[PDB]
């Protein structure tokens, strides 16, 4: 399960209720230290599509990170979803299956279902942990992208829609890092 909700659509008709308090002391068991090829490749093509001339040393670095975060984020999320009651809006689910249907079927609905749950949970902890991406951060982020790259990002600086779009993405990578920062992990290499 690759649990890592913005690519398409950035309050939702779906609701998430916290049934029990979360146990940040219960250690999370991590099942694997690696990822499958299909996944490393899908991301490698993503890094080459934005940094055509990206070197090797670079890829390993970024890719290595993608694996740990993914293995850790997924396992922490699988515990966190256990403290919530979810009411997934009938139509909202079909709209998510769309942005995913454009990029066999029950799999897509399982996926759409996980995108939504994640959303609701992140909405929740943002409160608890008090997390925010300021305009400063966003602006610097776009700038650094124009330096290492060279394409037009001007469109992102001055256009409320696009600019606020980058804030969302940044906010997602931060909740992930934040979720991971709040748990002790145990790696199941031999036993549990």
Curated annotation (Swiss-Prot):
Q: Name one GO biological process term.
A: protein folding
What InterPro entries does the entry give? Answer: MPN555-like, Trigger_fac_C_sf, Trigger_fact/SurA_dom_sf
NCBIfam families hit by this protein? MPN555
Query: What is this protein identified as?
Result: Uncharacterized protein MG377 homolog
Q: Which organism is it from?
A: Mycoplasma pneumoniae (strain ATCC 29342 / M129 / Subtype 1) (Mycoplasmoides pneumoniae)
Tell me the lineage of the source organism: Bacteria, Bacillati, Mycoplasmatota, Mycoplasmoidales, Mycoplasmoidaceae
